[PDB]
């Protein structure tokens, strides 16, 4: 997502850095996202839904 | 910004091509509606309220 | 006494001792402290490991306690 | 269960996607609180999900497929064999949709 | 694959809701919840061995009262050391 | 019983270790016993599977001499006990009333 | 530990002999025989856990003839990795 950085990087741009895996990085992102959807950390985040 | 689209990804909601421009009652005003007068330009279809 | 109502789990006793007392189903420290040494030696396998641990906690077997258990 | 209270933190001890589905039971127990029953029953459902649905992997869609599925399931749940017109009247759908739901029920194994 | 899988999930969920006393027709939004925080791909949800082993040991030491170690070994197919570990674990909790 | 190619499985059985191996001698002895008793020896493996599945799980130890014979006598005596045939057991087994009473006590003490 | 376990073992042996037509008392000989040929020390009796997995894979690839591998994951709930290893194993054996 390029947060704290001048630009973002796509799947292929991040693959050459760590590992060229295509579906594995996508499922890593999906796992991180679903971890962030847990109602143990997302209580504050849900308030930001209205904006 | 990265944060707002990060939230978009997290929850999946997408604000469509729509912006809120509805009229609101000015603050400190409480009353009763007496008349609603609607004018429409000729050529465009008129609503059922019209 | 805040130790009589505590269960036997607060002894940190050896595995052999932690197993022998389960045969008689001892659940309170007061329950075992009411029992004297002259009848707890009949169970197999302890005789050299209870006095020291009880003295370290300021207790000794054979004492007489009334209204036991108080529930 | 019962001891589940003490199990509250050990439920996610050295855990995995269980903890992810622990989030599920949160939602579940939330709806359970919405439902009126005691929320602490939720674990039962989830462990049942582990026993009768676990062991494999499933792909999940995102769009109108689940909408069609829920419409057809709400159509076919009240079918008794002689109430096609009843389904059409109740759910406000034509005979085509209810008949397609019936065919969906027939073609499965 | 996905439509039949989702149908099986929903009917089993609503059957369990009926078993638990809740209304079965409340299963759908649950799977919708299953969508909203889990949609996007395919994941492997095989066993979750932690809770299964924990409930197994819980039942094991529930059967245990004072001396049934032999019967525990015969039934659950676990040796006495596992029984000792379970008893120590249940001693840990107060 | 889907053993089927169990004869081929004997090579993995020949290539297994730990608790198995000795079990092959048990299967051979069981098949010899079945052949002596008239039953088909090939059934013996089935029997061993049963005695593998039901009796497994715990720790065991086996004596060799006098305890084995005493237990044999006691079990043979009490297997014919119906509740009121103590004299019948004494007459049939050629043992005293005390031996049959001890057999009853041993039968009732076990859990 | 020995007496009750030996008694139950003899009971099951004589029951199996009666089921198979053999005289139950012959079980004594059997147990005596094994008591001569199985001694040496202390070791817990279990099952053929290696043989358990062997027959598990045997059943898995006997049921397997193609896409039913998914049904295999639906049979009891297992991994595709072990199923593929079992398929390669059945290929190895002739």
UniProtKB/Swiss-Prot annotation, chain A:
Entry domain remark: Contains 4 domains, connected by flexible linkers. In the active conformation, the domains are in an extended conformation, each making extensive interactions with the RNA polymerase catalytic core.
Start-end of DNA-binding region: 11-30
Top-level division of the source organism's lineage: Bacteria
Name of the encoding gene: rpoD
The protein's name in its UniProt record: RNA polymerase sigma factor RpoD
Upper lineage: Bacteria, Pseudomonadati, Pseudomonadota, Gammaproteobacteria, Enterobacterales
UniProt record similarity statement: Belongs to the sigma-70 factor family. RpoD/SigA subfamily.
Region described as Sigma-70 factor domain-4: 1-38
Task performed by this protein: Sigma factors are initiation factors that promote the attachment of RNA polymerase to specific initiation sites and are then released. This sigma factor is the primary sigma factor during exponential growth. Preferentially transcribes genes associated with fast growth, such as ribosomal operons, other protein-synthesis related genes, rRNA- and tRNA-encoding genes and prfB.
Localisation per UniProt entry: Cytoplasm
Region listing for Interaction with anti-sigma factors, in residue ranges: 22-37
Record organism: Escherichia coli (strain K12)
UniProtKB/Swiss-Prot annotation, chain B:
Underlying gene: rpoB
Domain of life: Bacteria
Entry's family note: Belongs to the RNA polymerase beta chain family.
Record note on modification: Acetylated on several lysine residues in the presence of glucose.
Stated name of the protein: DNA-directed RNA polymerase subunit beta
Shown segment, full-protein numbering: 896 to 945 of 1342
Quaternary assembly: The RNAP catalytic core consists of 2 alpha, 1 beta, 1 beta' and 1 omega subunit. When a sigma factor is associated with the core the holoenzyme is formed, which can initiate transcription. The rRNA transcription and antitermination complex (rrnTAC) consists of RNAP, NusA, NusB, NusE (rpsJ), NusG, SubB, ribosomal protein S4, DNA and precursor rRNA; S4 is more flexible than other subunits. In pull-down experiments interacts with CedA. (Microbial infection) Interacts (via flap domain) with Escherichia phage lambda antitermination protein Q; this interaction renders bacterial RNAP resistant to transcription pausing and allows it to read through termination signals.
Transmembrane annotation, as ranges: none
Protein's job: DNA-dependent RNA polymerase (RNAP) catalyzes the transcription of DNA into RNA using the four ribonucleoside triphosphates as substrates. Resistance to the antibiotics salinamide A, salinamide B, rifampicin, streptolydigin, CBR703, myxopyronin, and lipiarmycin can result from mutations in this protein.
Curated annotation (Swiss-Prot), chain C:
Modified residues (ADP-ribosylarginine): 16
Top-level division of the source organism's lineage: Bacteria
Signal peptide coordinates: none
Coiled-coil region: none
UniProt region (Alpha C-terminal domain (alpha-CTD)), positions on chain: 1-71
Post-translational modification: (Microbial infection) ADP-ribosylated on both alpha subunits by the phage T4 protein ModA. ADP-ribosylated on only one of the alpha subunits by the phage T4 protein Alt.
Family statement drawn from the similarity comment of this UniProt entry: Belongs to the RNA polymerase alpha chain family.
Domain remark from Swiss-Prot or TrEMBL: The N-terminal domain is essential for RNAP assembly and basal transcription, whereas the C-terminal domain is involved in interaction with transcriptional regulators (such as CRP) and with upstream promoter elements.
Assembly and oligomerization: Homodimer. The RNAP catalytic core consists of 2 alpha, 1 beta, 1 beta' and 1 omega subunit. When a sigma factor is associated with the core the holoenzyme is formed, which can initiate transcription. Both the N- and C-terminus interact with different regions of transcriptional regulator CRP. The rRNA transcription and antitermination complex (rrnTAC) consists of RNAP, NusA, NusB, NusE (rpsJ), NusG, SubB, ribosomal protein S4, DNA and precursor rRNA; S4 is more flexible than other subunits.
Protein name as it appears in the record: DNA-directed RNA polymerase subunit alpha
Species this protein is from: Escherichia coli (strain K12)
Residues included from the entire protein: 250 to 324 of 329
Curated annotation (Swiss-Prot), chain F:
Localization in the cell: Host cytoplasm
Principal location class: host cell
InterPro entries noted in UniProt: c-mor_Regulatory_Protein, Homeodomain-like_sf, Mor_transcription_activator
Record feature DNA-binding region, as residue ranges: 85-105
Single GO term (MF): DNA binding
Superkingdom classification of source: Viruses
Known outcome of mutating residue 65 to R: Complete loss of DNA-binding and transcription activation ability
GO cellular component terms listed in the entry, alphabetical order: host cell cytoplasm
Induction of synthesis: This protein is constitively expressed from the Pgem promoter unlike most other early proteins which are expressed under the control of the Pe promoter. Its expression seems to escape repression by repressor protein c and thus could occur throughout latency.
Pfam families to which the protein is assigned, alphabetical: Mor
Stretches for region DNA-binding: 68-111
UniProt keyword terms in alphabetical order: Activator, DNA-binding, Early protein, Host cytoplasm, Transcription, Transcription regulation
Residue span of region Dimerization: 19-55
PANTHER family attached to this UniProt entry: MU-LIKE PROPHAGE FLUMU PROTEIN C
Protein family according to the UniProt entry: Belongs to the c/mor transcriptional regulatory family.
Subunit structure: Homodimer.
Domain notes per entry: The dimerization domain in the N-terminus and the DNA-binding domain in the C-terminus are connected by a linker containing a beta-strand.
Function text: Activator of the Pm promoter, which controls middle genes expression. Activation of Pm allows expression of protein C necessary for late gene expression. In addition to Mor binding, activation of Pm might require the interaction of Mor with the C-terminus of host RNAP subunits RpoA and RpoH.
Protein name, UniProt field: Middle operon regulator
Species this chain originates from: Escherichia phage Mu (Bacteriophage Mu)
